[PDB]
Amino acid sequence: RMEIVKIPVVVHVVWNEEEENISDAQIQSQIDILNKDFRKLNSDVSQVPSVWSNLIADLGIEFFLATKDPNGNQTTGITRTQTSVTFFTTSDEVKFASSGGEDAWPADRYLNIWVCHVLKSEIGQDILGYAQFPGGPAETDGVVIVDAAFGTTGTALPPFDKGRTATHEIGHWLNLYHIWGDELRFEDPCSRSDEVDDTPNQADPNFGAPSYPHVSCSNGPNGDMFMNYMDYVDDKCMVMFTQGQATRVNACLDGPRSSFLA
Amino acid sequence: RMEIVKIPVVVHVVWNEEEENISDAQIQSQIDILNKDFRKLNSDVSQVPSVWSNLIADLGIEFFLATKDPNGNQTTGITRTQTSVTFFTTSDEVKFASSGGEDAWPADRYLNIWVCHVLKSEIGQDILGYAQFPGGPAETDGVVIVDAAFGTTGTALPPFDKGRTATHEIGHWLNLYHIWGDELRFEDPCSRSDEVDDTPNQADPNFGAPSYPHVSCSNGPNGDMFMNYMDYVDDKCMVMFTQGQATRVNACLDGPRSSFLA
Numbered sequence: 026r027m028e029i030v031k032i033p034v035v036v037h038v039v040w041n042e043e044e045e046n047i048s049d050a051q052i053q054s055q056i057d058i059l060n061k062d063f064r065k066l067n068s069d070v071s072q073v074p075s076v077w078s079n080l081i082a083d084l085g086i087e088f089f090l091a092t093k094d095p096n097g098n099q100t101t102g103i104t105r106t107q108t109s110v111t112f113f114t115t116s117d118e119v120k121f122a123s124s125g126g127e128d129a130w131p132a133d134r135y136l137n138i139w140v141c142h143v144l145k146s147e148i149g150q151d152i153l154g155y156a157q158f159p160g161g162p163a164e165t166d167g168v169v170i171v172d173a174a175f176g177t178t179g180t181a182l183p184p185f186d187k188g189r190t191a192t193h194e195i196g197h198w199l200n201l202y203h204i205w206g207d208e209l210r211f212e213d214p215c216s217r218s219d220e221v222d223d224t225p226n227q228a229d230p231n232f233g234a235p236s237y238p239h240v241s242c243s244n245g246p247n248g249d250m251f252m253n254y255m256d257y258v259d260d261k262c263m264v265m266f267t268q269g270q271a272t273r274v275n276a277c278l279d280g281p282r283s284s285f286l287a
Numbered sequence: 288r289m290e291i292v293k294i295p296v297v298v299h300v301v302w303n304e305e306e307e308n309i310s311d312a313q314i315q316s317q318i319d320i321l322n323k324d325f326r327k328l329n330s331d332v333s334q335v336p337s338v339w340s341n342l343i344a345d346l347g348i349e350f351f352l353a354t355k356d357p358n359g360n361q362t363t364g365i366t367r368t369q370t371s372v373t374f375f376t377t378s379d380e381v382k383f384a385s386s387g388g389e390d391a392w393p394a395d396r397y398l399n400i401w402v403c404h405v406l407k408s409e410i411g412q413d414i415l416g417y418a419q420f421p422g423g424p425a426e427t428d429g430v431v432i433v434d435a436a437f438g439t440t441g442t443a444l445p446p447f448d449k450g451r452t453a454t455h456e457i458g459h460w461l462n463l464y465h466i467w468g469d470e471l472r473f474e475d476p477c478s479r480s481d482e483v484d485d486t487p488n489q490a491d492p493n494f495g496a497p498s499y500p501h502v503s504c505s506n507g508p509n510g511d512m513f514m515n516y517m518d519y520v521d522d523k524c525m526v527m528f529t530q531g532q533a534t535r536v537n538a539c540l541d542g543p544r545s546s547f548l549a
């Protein structure tokens with residue numbers, strides 16, 4: 026029998042122009058997707074090659090917008106903060122009131138999700154989202170997603186309009202690593218591990234919509250598990266976590282995030 | 288005539304075992320190095336190939352341990368905080384008391400330098416230090432260096448015992464990018480720029496002690512400027528900033544860090 030872990034979420038919408046102050050419906054659409062993907066209830070799980078059907082996991086996690094604020098008072102579970110800031114970066118400006126964002130709620134009790142319009146990496150690349158892995162400071166714990174990649178209605182835009190950026194970043198929040206192993210430019214692309222046996226060793230990230238099989242690192246004939254949420258493919262293409270990943274998630278819930286357990 | 292910008296520094300020593308509570312002498316040795324490297328007074332500047340002699344810059348910045356704390360009271364400019372934490376990461380745990388580190392002093396008035404024993408990247412690689420570029424939140428502004436790579440005496444160890452890790456990270460703090468451009472694994476290694484014309488286009492980081500010339504990206508015959516502080520070579524090998532880098536630094540001081548100006 027699975028113990029379903031129910032995670033309270035607070036969504037911090039940080040907006041400059043009115044259009045970025047995204048609707049309640051758009052936010053709720055994201056929660057709905059999380060409750061499918063983390064329970065193996067997404068219909069598109071049918072896309073997984075049958076050779077790997079046996080490895081598809083139900084992570085046994087569900088999410089809901091918080092009903093009580095950190096001090097025990099009724100809340101919608103959504104904060105909305107106007108800002109004059111035109112873009113945020115991975116340096117966490119969105120996570121502090123002082124830098125034109127919104128302060129985190131207590132990370133031992135809530136999953137903080139910030140949503141903003143523009144997000145850049147430290148070297149100016151536009152990105153869709155970023156996570157903090159377990160064990161970092163509470164002040165910046167959580168995930169950040171751009172509004173055009175959040176939810177399945179409103180400002181969400183293809184190919185990132187199926188809510189999978191949040192599924193991917195929350196995977197990091199639960200201690201999952203990129204399936205290809207995150208090699209640096211000069212390292213052998215077959216050399217690093219995501220620390221999960223049942224995800225095939227893989228060269229580089231996959232983007233777009235690859236055709237099965239996509240072989241790398243001598244992993245034929247089945248190839249890369251590019252339909253795993255921890256690859257970089259388009260939303261419609263990523264549809265599963267593995268049981269080996271569930272093991273890591275379980276270790277995260279039993280350890281550093283055990284405060285979320287009943 | 289150069290206007291010398293004088294930057295007050297606070298060093299936050301965060302220590303678990305006694306040996307990590309580094310000496311006043313070791314800390315002062317680091318300040319002494321910064322005051323040579325940022326003024327072109329380091330004797331090893333003679334190591335620069337003569338073809339590039341004309342490009343070597345005096346940044347006109349000097350550093351001193353703060354004499355007044357954030358509320359105007361006398362200070363040594365050094366905080367020392369015992370911790371039970373055994374390693375810190377790029378997630379900034381060392382920058383908050385809550386996560387076993389030490390809170391930043393106001394970033395508009397001080398350069399925060401944290402020193403700890405062990406530092407890892409997000410994927411568990413041992414690293415020597417890391418910076419926050421300008422514009423990020425004040426709470427985490429500054430640089431972090433491991434004690435074995437800090438100063439020129441005490442616990443500092445070759446090949447990182449000439450105080451250059453701090454010179455390099457403070458370069459980032461002043462808006463300088465890696466000279467090779469930070470390509471991702473799958474990108475053309477000649478494709479990204481550090482946004483400085485007088486640093487030659489360069490494939491990858493250099494490590495150790497390269498022999499001149501080291502050509503990449505068709506940048507012959509002179510090759511990579513691997514003796515620049517913003518490469519990744521050993522301390523004894525990095526000895527200069529360029530005038531083009533000085534331009535970026537000046538723009539940083541005139542803009543986002545203008546609060547440090549007299």
Ligand SMILES: [Ca+2]
Pocket residue numbers: 115116117165377378379427
């Ligand atoms: Ca941070």
Ligand SMILES: [Ca+2]
Pocket residue numbers: 204218219220221222223224225226
């Ligand atoms: Ca694997």
Ligand SMILES: [Ca+2]
Pocket residue numbers: 205206207208214215216217227228229
């Ligand atoms: Ca790989």
Ligand SMILES: [Ca+2]
Pocket residue numbers: 466480481482483484485486487488
């Ligand atoms: Ca250049």
Ligand SMILES: [Ca+2]
Pocket residue numbers: 467468469470476477478479489490491
């Ligand atoms: Ca390059």
Ligand SMILES: [Zn+2]
Pocket residue numbers: 193194197203
């Ligand atoms: Zn990711």
Ligand SMILES: [Zn+2]
Pocket residue numbers: 455456459465
């Ligand atoms: Zn660097």
